[PDB]
Amino acid sequence: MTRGRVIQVMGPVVDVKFENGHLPAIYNALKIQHKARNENEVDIDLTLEVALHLGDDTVRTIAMASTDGLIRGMEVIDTGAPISVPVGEVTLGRVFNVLGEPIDLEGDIPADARRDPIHRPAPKFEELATEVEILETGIKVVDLLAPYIKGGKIGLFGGAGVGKTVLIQELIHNIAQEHGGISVFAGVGERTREGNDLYHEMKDSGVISKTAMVFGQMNEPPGARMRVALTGLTMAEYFRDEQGQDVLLFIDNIFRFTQAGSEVSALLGRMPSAVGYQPTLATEMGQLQERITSTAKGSITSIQAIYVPADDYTDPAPATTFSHLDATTNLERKLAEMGIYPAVDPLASTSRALAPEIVGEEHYQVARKVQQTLQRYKELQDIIAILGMDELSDEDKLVVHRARRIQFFLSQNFHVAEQFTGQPGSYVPVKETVRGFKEILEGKYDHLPEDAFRLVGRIEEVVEKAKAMGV
Amino acid sequence: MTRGRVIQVMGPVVDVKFENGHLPAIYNALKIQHKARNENEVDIDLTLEVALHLGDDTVRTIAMASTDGLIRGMEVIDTGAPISVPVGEVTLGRVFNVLGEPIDLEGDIPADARRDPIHRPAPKFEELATEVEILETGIKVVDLLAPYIKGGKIGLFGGAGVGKTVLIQELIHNIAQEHGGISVFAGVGERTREGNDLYHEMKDSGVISKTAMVFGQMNEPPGARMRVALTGLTMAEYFRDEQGQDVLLFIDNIFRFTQAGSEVSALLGRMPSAVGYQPTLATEMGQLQERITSTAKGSITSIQAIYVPADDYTDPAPATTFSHLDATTNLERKLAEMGIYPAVDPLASTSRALAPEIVGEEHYQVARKVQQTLQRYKELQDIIAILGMDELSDEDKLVVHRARRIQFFLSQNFHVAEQFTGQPGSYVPVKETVRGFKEILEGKYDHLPEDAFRLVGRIEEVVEKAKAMGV
Amino acid sequence: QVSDVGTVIQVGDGIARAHGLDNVMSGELVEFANGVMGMALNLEENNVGIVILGPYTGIKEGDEVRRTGRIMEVPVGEALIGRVVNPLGQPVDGLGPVETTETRPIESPAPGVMDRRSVHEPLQTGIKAIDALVPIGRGQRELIIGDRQTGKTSVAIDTIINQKDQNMISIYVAIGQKESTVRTVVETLRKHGALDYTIVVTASASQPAPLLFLAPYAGVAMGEYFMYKGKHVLVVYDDLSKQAAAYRELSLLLRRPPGREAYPGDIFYLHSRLLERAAKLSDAKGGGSLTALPFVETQAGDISAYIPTNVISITDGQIFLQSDLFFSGVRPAINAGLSVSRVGGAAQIKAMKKVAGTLRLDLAAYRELEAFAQFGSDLDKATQAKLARGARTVEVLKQDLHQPIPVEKQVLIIYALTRGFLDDIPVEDVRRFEKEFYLFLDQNGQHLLEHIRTTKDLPNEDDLNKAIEAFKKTFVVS
């Protein structure tokens, strides 16, 4: 018979022994349901996922919840299939956990509903689509220096408290409410307060009727933090494949998945990698990221916020995830501390759509000129650091004069940021952004003070606030 | 007669079990000569070297070639002696591998030829010779600041791409053509392209009839790379001991011996050392280097190229190698980036021969003055790069003026550097270079442009090259 | 039908342990009950360590492992031209099976010392800076090293496209990339017509570590088949760092003790073995050649790192791409001071050798002198001329994406620059000067182009000077 027994319990890792010739395959889901026989036991309802075959009819699993109360010899049932979560029209407007069980207090889902396995292979080479199309966001720096791509993968790197969540919320406000297709939000190891705030925001804004949310936050154990992203991904994949619709996929923090994997790896019996990470860091991330892609049936555009530990961009987890992205924006603590509030690094951020045949010749030229002036200012910053601006030549002084104003004009006031500073946000068309930056490069506004370029939208507001102040 | 069987194969390390009381001694050679019984096997002709005794009649060995094709249970033959290579006039004009088998397609060595064991103890304290004599190389910087010693040990340090191979080739061109004795080249762990080029150059120049070459290169397994140096060493030792000849020993890269030794320590079962090297680093390096010495029966002068990983001179391999040398030449890529070749560091280079009673009082004083001027110049760069030359005193301005010219005149054009410079090479005697540096120190040519000193040879060619620029 | 069989003990993360297989061979292919292939790496006293070359989900403990009797082999032949294939040789483009009747071992000895010939014929990449400063010859292996988004892939794509008329087979190996990126590269090659002579081998990120580890060896094995028939092959390894990381993962999974940065001991031997198989064969061996362009990605421009140091110590030269140069406007961002070619000169046309024998050292000295004299007043007229010449050369070396230039035009523009005919042209106008100079040669200087294309030396300087003066008279400075 297909019933196991608990052998070892080591935190989130549980070993189960089965009968000979009846071992469950890898990624199968196991169930433990125990009733307390006496006052020295507790009730248990726990699910496990098969990870390795240890030999001697023993299987090593990862738990999806707390393992407190487990006793050696408990009976374990094998479901014969991986974790399956409901998919379809039923999941719209609902909130789910890692196991696909609703948590919004609106009732259960009928047991006859269609549900798909969590684990599946990635789409083949011949099914992919490689069209490049500009996606307008209304943010000046993103629209100018690193345009986003419709149907592509976008990553937002940054440290703690730099603005990743605010940028996610601004993008949701600007794009999701008008996208028209299905939107999926999959938080991974983030604040439950933030999840509740986003849920109430969507419910009040009415976009909740066409979105599905899955949540595995920081309170949860590493197995749930590892599999919540896959649950959200398969929910999005159903809409991409069976209906051919455009899907927005938001992942709140994809670094937490690799962090939970590294937490689990040590107990599984693997030798540590360079910085203590799991040796399988690259393959585990790759087999997740390759499923998030656009195909011939439909397109999925995904915006992922990526956490950078200890502000070290050379850390293996941030380092290996660059190759999976079409456009990236790098947030910097130095730029946020000077008040530049979108904090996007104008030289580190790159996009594949910044090509003359995609964005236009004048767009490309303006972007290249801005990048060149910013690079020259970065080079000069060492000399200004020690001996100031007095010894700079007349050319370098003009370069600094233009670069400071360009850097300040790269700032913008966001609609979401209205709660922090009482000012209302702005939405800037890309044509207006190009015209404003070309005018600044041409030297039209050299006489304006540099503090008049901060937190404004169109170039006319710079003149308006310079007139408001002394001029 | 006794035989063993293969019980375990782990990459380049093979374990063999013998009968009781018939174990092979350490450093003995073993042979595997399997013939394919059917179509599921391949023919094998492989040589192993005994490294450890593991107990239970089991011996751990290091393979001299690829271990692909090995099957557990293959019969192994013990030869009862270490690796033996032919010695004598037979080796002159021939090219050998690590096993002493010719690879020049010129025919096989007769089986009755004398063969000597690879491993032997080092010469004793009584029989060593310590007389010092200057070896003229025709290179200005070497002849001025760090003269080479006849019968001594010379090491060339440098990173990747700094000019070690070109310097070796130039030294060969200058010395081996007029040496009159025997010369041996050991191609340890370098490019087969470089080996072929050197072989063809020597064949065309005619030195090939007076030299023996042994090659173990990058494509070879670690055992060949860590025993080819000993093969060349014993070939040179035969001439030093039996015939009393003067021997030039050239080693392509002695760091590859250390690297190959470290590649297999973990498989041999030894705990790692500081930077991942084997624990026996210093012991093995000393046991190899101490055999390369001049004695009362004959003298060997050896020039070795030593690789410095990542330009870090504090790396354990160069740090341990430094103590084994009499004269030392340091190559820094800071001079290479600036277009100065051979890019010898004028300060870090040292030699036991730079003494007033060895080289002469005038030479000693001019070399010391050059070193003092360059040391003074090195300190001024840090303040120059910030405050400019205008703030320097009249003394320091003259110091910089003469030091730049001295550093530029330290360059030279090599005969082998035609492929890279177009212009031919030159040969500068020690008296001429001392005179030229004395004139430059006195300041005769302060009015000459600094560019006129680049890769020029003598000061006569400097003043003639100045005419081409109208000065 | 009978075969030696074993039983599976452990399964997980792409690594399997097997009991039995007493007559298994080191490096032999093995197959599982469900058809997935494997490779035997560790032959221990009582068990065998097998690396699974495919999806290991369907493999369970107790399953049987079956010997194949073959060393690791890959299909070879002309049927692979124009196809994208797995590292095992199976097509992934969906255009049908490949009809290969021959196979080669994936681990084979490199050509020996006596089997090679010195590199003596040029490989034209179509990029002015590479062709002038860092020449590449047939049989040479040149490293392309730099940070991310610096043009490393663009250089390789342009080099592959430039081989359209020159008789050479191209092989592009992609390790650890997105399949969408690979498809974009294939679409670019199909657009530019390079797919008629190009084989592309892909090993994406979702594939198991052994496929990434074996992809470069499969590519070089496919290249050797053409090399030993007298053909000339170009092989591109788009990332060796990801292959090294995959090998580290495999070694750690196989319980092999780690070294520096958890890398195994033979991480240098891996790349040395891979790269020593590219060579220029002698006339007795057929005269064929195989040239390789390995890629290394640095972190924040750090060159002292383990893998970059190891790869630099192996290849014949390196090309440096820097982000600060990239954003300053000079593209390709080749650092002339750091880039070097050990076969330079011998791998150049005679005219190019005449016109640019010193240009790399000239640019290195100019870069040294620009840093000095920045604080000062550029007083000396000699220093004031060196800086002027350096600026002209730097602005001349710039080039646009997918804009190849023939070597006959490259030598002409380098001659015009280096002979002093650009000394009276402002820096801001020399690019348009070159653009118009090419049309002027196309319209009136056909004989010079034909002479350079037929006899590899320069024409008589009198006619060339007269043509340059005529173009200068026609040209107007803006």
Ligand SMILES: Nc1ncnc2c1ncn2[C@@H]1O[C@H](COP(=O)(O)OP(=O)(O)OP(=O)(O)O)[C@@H](O)[C@H]1O
């Ligand atoms: N556009 C903005 N305008 C004003 N303040 C901002 C803006 N973006 C971010 N901030 C400030 O930065 C703080 C942190 O932002 P946010 O929560 O988005 O950071 P994060 O990168 O998600 O950090 P964590 O790692 O804590 O989740 C905000 O509370 C706010 O004070």
Ligand SMILES: Nc1ncnc2c1ncn2[C@@H]1O[C@H](COP(=O)(O)OP(=O)(O)OP(=O)(O)O)[C@@H](O)[C@H]1O
């Ligand atoms: N004296 C010189 N004159 C001209 N060019 C030189 C000179 N020395 C070195 N170079 C240039 O620098 C390169 C250095 O290559 P070389 O083979 O000498 O390096 P190495 O320091 O021995 O390194 P490795 O053996 O680790 O690859 C040469 O190929 C050549 O381009």
Ligand SMILES: Nc1ncnc2c1ncn2[C@@H]1O[C@H](COP(=O)(O)OP(=O)(O)OP(=O)(O)O)[C@@H](O)[C@H]1O
């Ligand atoms: N000569 C050039 N002129 C203009 N743009 C260029 C040039 N070379 C490359 N680019 C652009 O630079 C960007 C980066 O190039 P590419 O993707 O080939 O670099 P990479 O180093 O291979 O990057 P990755 O790290 O993403 O693999 C691309 O948008 C490409 O179009």
Ligand SMILES: [Mg+2]
């Ligand atoms: Mg956040």
Ligand SMILES: [Mg+2]
């Ligand atoms: Mg060398």
Ligand SMILES: [Mg+2]
């Ligand atoms: Mg690339």
